[PDB]
């Protein structure tokens, strides 16, 4: 079963969520098992250009109207879901198809490369605003419990 | 604790070294474009580049120079008069038909390393680029050779930053690397593979190569009455980073960590 | 006589294309060095030593011209390449507006103000000295880019010599009217020839393009360190105060000794 | 009085058929223009100062290009007078009684021509006001003219 890969000493550097100095942050190379109804935490992210890196699958940026996601490293699975779709289900009964474009990197964090932010958790679907709106979820919540599965085409 | 403080310096040190690594991107790209814009290949240019490197030998720093003597480091020592790492050959890791520069469903983009048909090392890659130009009787030998020599020093210095980066990464992620280095199940060869894998962050690689492609396109803009760049100029700028600079830097980093296994 | 003028015009067109071809390499090489980092300890000395150890000699045509009386004015002290020590006379005022349109004058006036460095060697040395000292910049890379730039600017202005020979055949009567005028002193012939060679509308065309290139090629990308202040200004100044006027003087010097061909 | 400065052997290069220089004839150069009288007789020609057009290089006064709606002109080298009219206005009077104020932005270079730099076109004549399309439209002149008899004067302040 999926175990941590290690941990990193927090540094807040110049980040204004930021890593905090007195702690350690865990890293992961794996994610939970992928089932036909995979339980995950949906977070909120913008994939647009300006003022974060290019999307891992394509080297591109995506404006907030695009329904795109990043997956925790384990689910990202070396790129095997790149430019494939996943079906996301929210607890309120809404669902949306989203394009996998990026990795939510759980292997590294708390450095200038990641704006001194912590490493992604290992069960994350990091969704654009349009994913949240399609799910009828309140973007002020910051995170939501979801399920997802690989979609056919 | 004493440990925690040492890790924190280490991250601070790594951040600064990473900035230094990225700072080579634009100069390498500008130097390639300057030589490509300047003209065709001068008679005996390759020979003149070696003579220039021989006559104007810059020696590496003392720490690197010694490292180059040690066996691990000696694989990055070049035949005189070439600078360090420009003869190092990474093993072929891609297939002949690997798609290099566009998104592939179920794989991603910008796969790193050499295909069988790629030149063995950076010296041969740049030599091949030069040979693809026609011999020119009007190109200025001094300018052309000087830009060639500039590029060789730039690419060598860029990848050699892997060595101090590796030492900073080792202190920053001490437990991660020692868990590999102290594993008595692994051969020296398997430890190298696992270290390289721990050192590899392809999402960061895509970030770099996306920007390199963008820079090469933007900086190769033609203005009124300019002579065009030779075909594939932008392709070869990307290939330099994707097939050589990134994987060689990583390998230098892995070599360095392996040299400091006694610190576990 | 027709045919020779036609041939010369053709030849001039090709040489002008070769001259313009230096624009982008010079600018990219300045930007590469500026993006790279600060100044290394003893960088200037290392530049001189590199020029000595890798001494490129000019072509036999150039090396022999540099032995003639007019050409000798462009021979530099070893190990510097030709023309990089040549000093044009001050022609602008301290407050002359250099890079903006001036009502009743125009734009991009050529040449040196009293405060400009005397020659290209000093101009590039002043640029290098304006950088901060750095312990992280790679000495080999920095010196090699410095040397590239010195070789580029020398080769660029030396194209004035074959350009002048072609212009002489193309505009034979114009120059011969000056050269065979027995009322004019040597220096008045030089002045009149320089004026015949000067076309400010073409100068504005070049310098406008150099300004565009310097802006486009200095574009900043994701997480890049900015260029030092005034990088673009000094690129323009290199062309406007040195490369263009020195090229014109090289052309004038080449013409001046050609009265026997009239 | 104003005399030619010399002449140049025509070469057509790759120019199409604005007139090209023709092989087998010479083209006159001038450093001077006729006297500026305050109602100076001139020939108005038609030109585009726009960037894309490939008619020309950057404008001598400003290093810029101008789209065809701008009322701008170039002046023969002598009247251009080393830049003394740069970014000043001239009042142009056409034979039909219309007049227009135009900005001087460029030199119609009479010192050189029939080379690749000028797309193998001849040197400007020495009595030219080379006007943008908006100049002609403002004067009510039919651009199919190609040239018109005018008078011009400096707009002083």
Swiss-Prot record, chain B:
According to its UniProt entry, the protein's GO biological process terms are: aromatic amino acid family biosynthetic process; chorismate metabolic process; effector-mediated suppression of host salicylic acid-mediated innate immune signaling
Q: Where in this protein does the record put region KWL1-binding extensive loop region (ELR)?
A: 92-115
Q: What happens when the gene is disrupted?
A: Decreases significantly the amount of tumors produced during host maize infection.
Location in or out of the cell = Secreted; Host cytoplasm, Host cytosol
Instruction: Kindly state one GO CC term assigned in the UniProt record.
Output: host cell cytosol
Induction entry: Expression is specifically up-regulated during biotrophic development. CMU1 is one of the most highly expressed fungal genes during plant colonization.
Q: What class of enzyme is it?
A: isomerase
**InterPro entries associated with the record:** Chorismate_II_sf (IPR036263), CM_AroQ_sf_eucaryotic (IPR037039)
Effect seen on changing residue 169 to A? Impairs catalytic activity
Q: What is its EC number?
A: 5.4.99.5
Keyword annotations of the record: Allosteric enzyme, Glycoprotein, Host cytoplasm, Isomerase, Secreted, Signal, Virulence
Glycosylation site positions? 134, 183
Activity control summary = Contrary to classical chorismate mutases, CMU1 is not subject to allosteric regulation by tryptophan and tyrosine. Activity is decreased in a non-competitive and allosteric manner by the binding of the host defense kiwellin KWL1 which probably blocks substrate access to the active site of CMU1.
Q: A Gene Ontology molecular-function term?
A: chorismate mutase activity
Q: Which chemical reaction does it catalyze?
A: chorismate = prephenate
Q: What is known of its domains?
A: The extensive loop region (ELR) is specific for fungal secreted chorismate mutases and is required for the interaction with the host defense kiwellin KWL1.
Q: What does this protein do?
A: Secreted chorismate mutase that is one component of a cocktail of effectors shaping the host metabolome and acting as virulence factors. The enzyme is taken up by plant cells, can spread to neighboring cells where it affects the biosynthesis of the plant immune signal salicylic acid by channelling chorismate into the phenylpropanoid pathway. Interferes with the activity of host cytosolic chorismate mutase CM2 through heterodimerization.
User: What does the annotation say about its assembly with partners?
Assistant: Homodimer. Forms a heterodimer with the host cytosolic chorismate mutase CM2. Interacts with the host kiwellin KWL1 which acts as a defense protein that protects maize from infection.
Protein's recorded name: Secreted chorismate mutase
Phylogenetic lineage: Eukaryota, Fungi, Dikarya, Basidiomycota, Ustilaginomycotina
Swiss-Prot record, chain D:
Gene Ontology annotations for the cellular component aspect, listed alphabetically: apoplast
Q: What induces it?
A: Induced by the fungal pathogen Ustilago maydis.
Quaternary structure and interacting proteins, as annotated: Monomer. Interacts with Cmu1 of the fungal pathogen Ustilago maydis. A structural feature specific to the fungal secreted Cmu1 called extensive loop region (ELR) is required for the intimate interaction. Does not interact with its own chorismate mutases.
Task: Cite the GO molecular-function annotations of the record.
Answer: enzyme inhibitor activity
Instruction: Say which species the protein is native to.
Output: Zea mays
Q: What does this protein do?
A: Specifically blocks the catalytic activity of the chorismate mutase Cmu1 from the fungal pathogen Ustilago maydis. Hinders substrate access to the active site of Cmu1 through intimate interactions. A structural feature specific to the fungal secreted Cmu1 called extensive loop region (ELR) is required for the intimate interaction. Does not interact with its own chorismate mutases. The secreted fungal Cmu1 presumably affects biosynthesis of the plant immune signal salicylic acid by channelling chorismate into the phenylpropanoid pathway.
- Give the similarity note: Belongs to the kiwellin family.
**Which cysteines link up through disulfide bonds?**
2-32, 15-20, 21-114, 61-86, 108-124
UniProt keywords, alphabetically: Apoplast, Disulfide bond, Glycoprotein, Plant defense, Secreted, Signal
**Places the protein is found:** Secreted, Extracellular space, Apoplast
Q: What is this protein called?
A: Kiwellin-1
One Gene Ontology biological process = host-mediated perturbation of symbiont process
């Amino acid at each position: 079963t999926c175990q941590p890969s290690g941990s990193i000493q927090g540094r807040s550097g110049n980040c204004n969520e930021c890593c905090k100095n007195g702690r350690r942050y865990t890293t992961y190379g794996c994610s939970p098992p992928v089932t036909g109804s995979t339980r995950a935490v949906l977070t909120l992210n913008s994939f647009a250009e300006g003022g974060g890196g290019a999307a891992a699958c394509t080297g591109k940026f995506y404006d907030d109207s695009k329904k795109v996601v990043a997956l925790s490293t384990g689910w990202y699975n070396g790129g095997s879901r790149c430019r494939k779709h996943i079906m996301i289900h929210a607890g309120n009964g809404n669902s949306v198809s989203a394009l996998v474009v990026d990795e939510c990197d759980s292997t590294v964090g708390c450095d200038k490369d990641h704006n001194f932010e912590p490493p992604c958790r290992n069960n994350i679907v990091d969704g654009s605003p349009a994913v949240w709106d399609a799910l009828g979820l309140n973007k002020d919540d910051g995170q939501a419990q979801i399920t997802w599965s690989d979609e056919l085409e | 604790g004493k440990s925690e403080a040492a890790e924190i310096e280490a991250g601070d040190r790594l951040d600064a070294l990473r900035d230094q690594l990225q700072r080579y991107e634009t100069p390498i790209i500008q130097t390639i474009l300057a030589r490509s814009a300047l003209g065709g290949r001068a008679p005996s240019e390759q020979d003149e580049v070696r003579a220039a490197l021989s006559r104007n030998a810059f020696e590496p720093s003392e720490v690197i120079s010694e490292w180059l003597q040690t066996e691990s480091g000696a694989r990055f020592r070049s035949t005189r008069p070439l600078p360090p790492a420009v003869e190092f050959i990474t093993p072929v890791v891609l297939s002949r038909d690997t798609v290099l520069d566009k998104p592939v469903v179920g794989k991603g983009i910008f796969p790193i390393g050499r295909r069988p048909q790629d030149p063995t090392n950076m010296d041969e890659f740049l030599d091949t680029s030069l040979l693809s130009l026609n011999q020119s009787s009007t190109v200025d030998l001094a300018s052309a050779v000087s830009l060639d020599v500039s590029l060789l020093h730039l690419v060598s210095a860029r990848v050699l930053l892997g060595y101090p980066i590796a030492l900073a990464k080792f202190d920053w992620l001490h437990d991660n690397f020692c868990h590999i280095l102290t594993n008595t199940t692994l051969s020296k060869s398997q430890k190298l593979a696992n270290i390289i894998q721990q050192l590899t962050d392809h999402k960061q690689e895509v970030n770099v190569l996306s920007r390199v492609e963008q820079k090469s396109k933007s900086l190769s803009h033609l203005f009124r009455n300019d002579i065009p760049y030779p075909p594939h100029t932008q392709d070869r700028i990307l290939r330099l980073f994707q097939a050589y600079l990134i994987p060689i830097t990583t390998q230098i980093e892995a070599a360095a960590i392996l040299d400091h296994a006694n610190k576990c």
